[PDB]
Amino acid sequence: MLIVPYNLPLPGGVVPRMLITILGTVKPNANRIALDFQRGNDVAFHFNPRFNENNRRVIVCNTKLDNNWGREERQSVFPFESGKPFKIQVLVEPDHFKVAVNDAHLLQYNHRVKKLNEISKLGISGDIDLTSASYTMI
Numbered sequence: 165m166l167i168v169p170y171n172l173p174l175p176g177g178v179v180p181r182m183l184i185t186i187l188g189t190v191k192p193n194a195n196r197i198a199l200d201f202q203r204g205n206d207v208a209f210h211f212n213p214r215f216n217e218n219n220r221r222v223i224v225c226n227t228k229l230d231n232n233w234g235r236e237e238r239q240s241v242f243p244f245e246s247g248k249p250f251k252i253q254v255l256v257e258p259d260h261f262k263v264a265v266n267d268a269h270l271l272q273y274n275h276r277v278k279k280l281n282e283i284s285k286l287g288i289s290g291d292i293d294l295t296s297a298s299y300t301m302i
C-alpha cells in the first residue's frame with residue numbers, strides 16, 4: 165500500500181506519551197526490516213529485525229551518531245514471521261522507547277539521544293508491505 169522506504173514526519177519531534185503505530189505484512193522470505201527514528205542525519209533509535217543473521221533471527225537496536233553506529237542492544241525474542249501481518253507500537257516514555265509487537269511487550273531502548281523534540285522523522289524500510297504508519301498522544 166504505502167511506498168517503502170517510507171518517511172513519517174514527527175512534528176516537533178517526539179515526547180513522552182507519543183505512541184507510534186506501524187501496521188504491515190512481512191514479505192515472504194524477508195531478510196530485514198528497519199525503523200529509524202532520526203535526528204537529522206543521526207539515528208536516535210534504529211529497530212532492526214534480521215531474519216537470517218548466520219541462520220538466526222534477531223532484533224538489533226542501536227543509535228548512529230556522526231555516521232558511527234554505537235553499541236548494539238540485542239535480545240532473542242522475535243515475534244515477526246515471513247508472510248504474516250504485524251503491528252508495531254512504539255511508546256515514547258520519559259527514559260526509553262517501549263516497543264510492543266502484536267500487543268505483546270517486546271523491548272525497551274534507553275534514550276541515548278537526549279533532544280527528543282529534535283527526533284523529527286521516522287523512516288520505515290525493508291521487506292514489508294506497509295499498510296499504515298501514524299501517531300497519537302495517549
Ligand SMILES: OC[C@H]1O[C@H](Sc2ccc(Cl)c(Cl)c2)[C@H](O)[C@@H](n2cc(-c3cc(F)c(F)c(F)c3)nn2)[C@H]1O
Pocket residue numbers: 196197198210212224225226233234235236289290291
Ligand atoms: O548496529 C546496527 C547496524 O549494524 C550494521 S553496521 C554494524 C556492523 C557491526 C557492528 Cl558491531 C555495528 Cl555496531 C554496526 C548494519 O549494516 C546497519 N544497517 C542496517 C541497515 C538497513 C537498511 C535497510 F534499507 C533496511 F531495509 C534494513 F532493514 C536495514 N542499514 N544499516 C545497522 O543495522
